[PDB]
From a paper:
In general, transaminases catalyse the transfer of an amino group from an amino donor to a carbonyl acceptor with pyridoxal 5′-phosphate (PLP) as cofactor. Herein, we report the discovery of a new class of fold IV-transaminases, which was discovered during our quest for novel (R)-selective transaminases using an enrichment-based approach. In contrast to exclusive amino acid transaminases such as D-ATAs and BCATs, CpuTA1 and MgiTA1 are in addition able to convert amines to ketones, which would categorise them in the subclass of amine transaminases. Considering this and based on sequence and structural analysis, which revealed significant differences especially also in the active site, we propose that CpuTA1 and MgiTA1, might form a new subgroup in the fold IV family of PLP-dependent enzymes.
The crystal structure of CpuTA1 was determined by X-ray crystallography at a resolution of 2.4 Å. The final model contains 587 amino-acid residues (chain A and B), two pyridoxal-5′-phosphate (PLP), one 3-amino benzoic acid (3-ABA) and 327 water molecules. The asymmetric unit contains two polypeptide chains, which form a stable dimer with a contact surface of 5580 Å2 (PDBePISA29). CpuTA1 exhibits the typical aminotransferase type IV fold (InterPro: IPR001544, Pfam: Pf01063). The electron density for the PLP cofactor is well defined and the covalent imino bond to the active site Lys174 residue is clearly visible. The phosphate group is interacting through a network of hydrogen bonds to the side chains of Arg75, Thr234, Thr235 and Ser271, the backbone amides of Thr234, Thr235 and Ser271, and two water molecules. The two active sites are located at the interface of the two polypeptide chains with the main portion located in one chain, and vice versa. The active site is surrounded by the residues R51*, F56, T58, F115, K117, E125, E140, F142, Y178, S270, S271, and V272 (*indicates that the residues belongs to the other chain). These amino acids are building two binding pockets, whereby the small binding pocket is lined by T58, S270, S271 and V272 and the large binding pocket by R51*, F56, K115, E125*, E140, F142 and Y178. Overall, the structure of CpuTA1 confirms that except for the PLP binding amino acids hardly any of the active site amino acids is conserved compared to the characterised fold IV subgroups. Interestingly, a flexible loop (e.g. aa K125-I135 in AT-ωTA), which is present in (R)-ATAs13151735 as part of the active site (the loop of chain B as part of the active site of chain A and vice versa containing an arginine residue, which is discussed to play a role in dual substrate recognition of (R)-ATAs131535) is significantly shorter in CpuTA1 (aa E125-G128) and does not contain any positively charged amino acid.
Numbering used by the authors:
A (entry chain B): 3 to 15, 28 to 304
B (entry chain A): 2 to 15, 25 to 308
The structure:
């Protein structure tokens, strides 16, 4: 059901540079540095009614993530055509239908070959209908200071890397606390991001989000959230947001490409009011864009 | 292919005779599904084990630590008897095809599995090790900020500190940073200034006739090689000590080693461009002890 493409020309030093492969058969060598060391980057792109959302920003961020890990530069033209070909292959077979997504995976390759690996696959996504009406959240220490990306770039803060064990570990801690998700806080007390998403704060009538140089991802959904609010007439701001400001905010959301906007009903067990109509308009906009 | 690969089909506790829990597979062919959480999320644990003269070194310690890493990641308990059997069968198959000769290694990989499926994945492969003869004579090292407080394992267990996980992108990034500075390896230093470990090794400190190593609740691995290194030094009358070692104390050390299963003991010639003496005979004796310890057990 899922479409998988192998990307045979993923990076820059009439061949398409990618081939269809069997999603249900093994495809990665046991010594691919992507699995023995989590040494790669990825992007997840939502595909709504056959259109990839924020395609160019996603491809640019793949290059940015690759650069942070000293990977070779991704061949934008090939990755672009592979996303489009995989969506086209999925829709032809499974027809039109629900929300889809394309996942791009780029690794340093089989150990010892100096030849990076790449895959794109396209599948139907998990159902987020409930999560888009509300989620509970806890804050968790991320260990790093908010300025790691300036002092210590070998820690890869702000790279969308394959090494997400700790991100997953954060989800499990949240579930043990009855929560659905996490907002990370830096060791010096600043709100950062979620394990798979960015945080949006409505406070003092302003739509805020932690500045993107604090070792976090510049979210593509977050940027689109800002366009929504700016056109609707809210002011928007990139800021350093302390842990305390978080709990004093009027309202909160986690946002990301596939789930879109998920409003926070509780943060660390303190309740927050969810404006159902405002969030519904937000998610309608996020789902309908370009 | 030269290397041996075993698929572990019963990696974890929740069997018919004839089902050992593992079967040979082609190391040269693709083996992992693209949605295995081991590659999409680096969500798994691993062990690397030196195999000297047909024998895996410290096999039970490694298996114990596989389980400990598994537990830190909320994975199910690895079936120690399947993994043990899998490693020995792998060593056996490698040697029956390739003969003996040479230092080998076995690598154990355990992941949360194909996503949506609730079934961990597991693999073992055996292959010839990298030539470390030069590094065993000396390496240049630099100190790099790890970003964590020495105590993150106590306060923040979701940060997986002290787990041997597949999410090693940063450990590799540290090596690339050291190479930029013309160095071979890295000693991590915590936010609060404590010597921790290397991205793939543990740190041994000689100072004032005492052999020390950072104590292993500081969000670091308890190294199987470090334990064998303590055995060597105690046998020669050195006192050994686990403790907190500030980055300052590390500079004032008389000698330093990075130790790990495959490279064994690599003596440090320079740390952040400060020179350190290397006792070539004592280190050669250390490596000879480290290479020969498992023969005793058999
Ligand atoms: C750590 C992290 N933060 C934020 C995001 C949100 O990115 P996007 O909105 O582009 O999907 C992702 C994905 C992520 O992995
Ligand atoms: C992060 C890390 N530290 C230390 C070590 C050393 O452990 P061992 O001597 O058992 O190989 C390893 C391996 C490691 O991955
Ligand atoms: N590269 C290499 C070296 C030796 C043997 C083989 C093999 O296929 O047996 C391969």
């Amino acid at each position: 059901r899922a479409t998988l493409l192998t990307v045979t020309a993923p990076t820059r030093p009439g061949d398409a540079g990618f081939v269809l492969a069997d999603f249900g058969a093994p495809q990665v060598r046991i010594t691919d540095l992507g699995i023995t060391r989590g040494d790669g980057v990825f992007e997840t792109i939502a595909v709504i009614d056959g259109h990839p959302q924020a395609l160019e920003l996603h491809l640019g961020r793949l290059a940015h993530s690759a650069a942070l890990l000293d990977l070779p530069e991704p061949d934008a033209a090939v990755w672009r055509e592979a996303v489009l070909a995989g969506v086209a292959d999925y829709r032809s077979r499974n027809g039109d239908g629900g929300e889809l997504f394309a996942k791009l995976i780029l690794t340093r390759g089989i150990e010892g070959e100096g030849r990076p690996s790449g895959w794109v696959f396209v599948d139907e996504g998990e159902d987020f209908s409930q999560q888009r009406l509300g989620i509970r959240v806890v804050t968790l220490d991320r260990g790093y200071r908010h300025d790691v990306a300036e002092t210590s770039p070998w820690l890869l803060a702000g790279a969308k890397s394959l090494s997400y064990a700790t991100n997953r570990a954060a989800g499990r801690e949240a579930a043990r606390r009855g929560a659905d998700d996490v907002i990370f806080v830096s060791s010096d007390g600043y709100a950062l991001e979620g394990p798979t998403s960015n945080v949006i704060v409505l406070a003092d009538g302003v739509v805020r989000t932690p500045q993107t140089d604090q070792g976090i991802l510049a979210g593509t959904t977050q940027a689109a959230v800002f366009d929504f609010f700016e056109e609707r007439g809210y002011p928007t701001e990139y800021r350093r947001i302390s842990a305390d400001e978080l709990r004093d905010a009027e309202a909160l959301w986690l946002v990301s490409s596939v789930r879109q906007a998920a409003p926070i009903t509780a943060l660390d067990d303190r309740e927050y009011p969810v404006d159902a109509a405002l969030t519904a308009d937000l998610n309608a906009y996020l789902l309908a864009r370009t």
